[model samples]
Target: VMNRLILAMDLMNRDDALRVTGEVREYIDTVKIGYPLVLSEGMDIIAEFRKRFGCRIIADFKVADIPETNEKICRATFKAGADAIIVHGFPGADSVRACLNVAEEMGREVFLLTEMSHPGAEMFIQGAADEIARMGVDLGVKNYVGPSTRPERLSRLREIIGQDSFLISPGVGAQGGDPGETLRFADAIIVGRSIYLADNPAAAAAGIIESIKD
Candidate 1:
């Protein structure tokens, strides 16, 4: 029932990001601003993207900090026009609660990072992914991040979090994840280079959408 594709805009330059997003705007359900984009252009880029595309924007800051810092960062991200912000679940209840509180107050959403998409992530996130997912659920978080490359783990986390919650998977295409398999568990797949780096970004995005629809 879940059908959404989040475009991960990890590009550093504002113009490049805008061009790519504009090209594929019709195909994407949401736009995820990764750390590089945020660090390079700050909130101005987020504001501009919102104004231009009018699509949901996810601030992928992966926030991991003390409660106060988490609150401040979530507030700033929402104020900057992000529809949702990603936070690290490793920070535990208090920190997650802080960000959740801000989201509640600001009418924004929060996506908790249970496991990452990189090769080395297992070293740190392996045994703890379920624990983090449970903590997020207990704290009322409705969105989670899991690796698209690991369908078993993603499935396990989905069961732990229940159907009411949604999972967003990163690591598709360039990261070698099978979208067909990932879509079995993930509500939305975060695609980066597979689309952005393609000669025709719009065609690439459409292909991804068509594959999922099929």
Candidate 2:
């Protein structure tokens, strides 16, 4: 049922990390490796996750820097077997173009981080989203990561970028962002603390999948 669900394992240690991953791996298509896990355990954790779960791995570094620097980091991320990577859209046109160029050359998917789910998300991401949507004409990558707090906003984004472009929606579950609302437009939902903090992370994840189906 879950063609696209990202369960975040933001735990600090190996035991908790493995436990959370083992519990939810069955119901999710991707595991998001954020700062804490990646920084603490490094690529070994990513490699283990791939070996044990056999699902897509996303390195959400949100890298934003100069053109050459961004390209090198993107390359390193791909080398770690990351199925997808995220880059900040506010990182200027040249930087974003460099990121797309690297992704094209390496054949890896890049999800432009145009929005965040936090309170100040709109203030920062609104302008970036508009710019990215405008610039999307040149780049053929059919994916964008942003907030799904409002269905209308997501719908508008789809209109700008096209329906085929995937949207990775986060902030659901414990974060209080509604999964049902997101299903109206989101192609994928990234749930982190919601499932990770639940008494049964797997069941928590399964609940979202069921909710999406409804």
Candidate 3:
């Protein structure tokens, strides 16, 4: 499980990302080691993160290609020690299923992204997002990603995916979404710069947890 807070470690360098993550380790047990850091430091960083902090790594590569390529991507990612791989549902069932199949064989999991959190997503992603969520459900998806910045859309996604599927959200903190508010729909919230770029990453994480206190 995520411990309700997944740190989006989008920081570009190893030292800074690891340092800030170490500082906030007590608050977050799961880390989204996206392309920024992985591209900069290489896949070796995922194993290092697990060895150093004992955190769950989600490879947010947004795998969006052919089934063959998707399988290879999933294999390489899981091989690098990622606990879960995030794939794009917009690419259709075949693409999403390719990642899921690899994940199944490797005994890992796939988190499907129905909609992104940025302004540009509204251009097209918003329209098909619900259908994408439905497709994920049809594909027997257990985990999903949605936008925390759009509560209505997120709640609708939660409705589409139903209560059984695990849902995580992004766009909180720096993106103006409230931690407590986002948690109402998502199973866990993904936070990035607002915590990693803080004067005290630990304190920032602690504060976010405080707001969402049950």
Candidate 4:
């Protein structure tokens, strides 16, 4: 069980990030590591977290590149120990397909990022998000990364991908989204600053878990 909570470990410092995550480890079973930590601590950090907490690791690289490059990135990431990787669907089906094939070969998973959580994402990511989602379905994508800041779009993506596919959303807590409301559509919510940046990371995470109790 993930406890319906995925920690978005965005902190850059190795010691700080590890400490914060360890503090809240009991509240989450999956950790989403973006470029911030991976770039700073290197991919081996994935294995470190796994060994330390016995949790699942997701590489949120938001891969957006050519077909060949996408495949290579996926391979390298999975080799480093990611259970799943996040790829940008806006890059077109071919690029997304590259990751799909690589993950299939490695027996891992891929999560297509259809939309972003920030307000600026509306400029372009919003317009093409729907098409990207549709393309993901056509390409046989079974997992997705959507926005928690916009519940409406999140639900729309759910309707597009159907109930079987795994859907996860970010932008909760510090981003002004309610965990219970976000979980209404997403299988789990990705939280960052609200927990990691708090004085008491464990309590902050526990608080959110408590709020979402149903």
Q: How far is each candidate from the true structure, as Cα RMSD in Å?
A: 1.4, 1.6, 0.9, 0.9
Order of the predicted models by TM-score, top scorer first: 3, 4, 1, 2
Q: Which ten residues in a row have the lowest lDDT in candidate 3?
A: 1-10
User: Would you list the C-alpha lDDT of every candidate in the order shown?
Assistant: 0.90, 0.79, 0.93, 0.92
Report model 1's TM-score to 2 decimal places: 0.97
Cα TM-score of candidate 2:
0.93
Q: TM-score for every candidate vs. truth?
A: 0.97, 0.93, 0.98, 0.98
Please, what are the lDDT tens digits per residue for candidate 2 over residues 106-200?
88888877667777876767757767765654566567876766566677777777777778887777666898888777888888888888899
Better of 1 and 2 by lDDT: 1
lDDT of 3: 0.93
Model 1 C-alpha lDDT per residue in residues 1-214, reported as the tens digit of each score: 1247889999899899999999998888589997898888888898899889888899999999999999999998999999999999887899999999999999989999998878888898877889999999889899999999889998998999998898899999999998889989988899999999899999998998889889
Ranking by lDDT: 3, 4, 1, 2
How many backbone clashes does every candidate have?
A: 0, 0, 0, 0
Which residue segments of model 4 deviate by more than 4 Å?
none
**Candidate 3 residue-wise lDDT, 1-214, digit = tens:** 4459999999999999989999999888999999999999999999999999999999999999999999999999999999999999888999999999999999999999988899999999999999999999999999999999999999999999999899999999898888888988999999998998899888999888888886
- Runs of candidate 2 with Cα error greater than 4 angstroms are 1-3
Relative to the true structure, candidate 4 reaches a TM of 0.98
lDDT pick, better of 2 and 3: 3
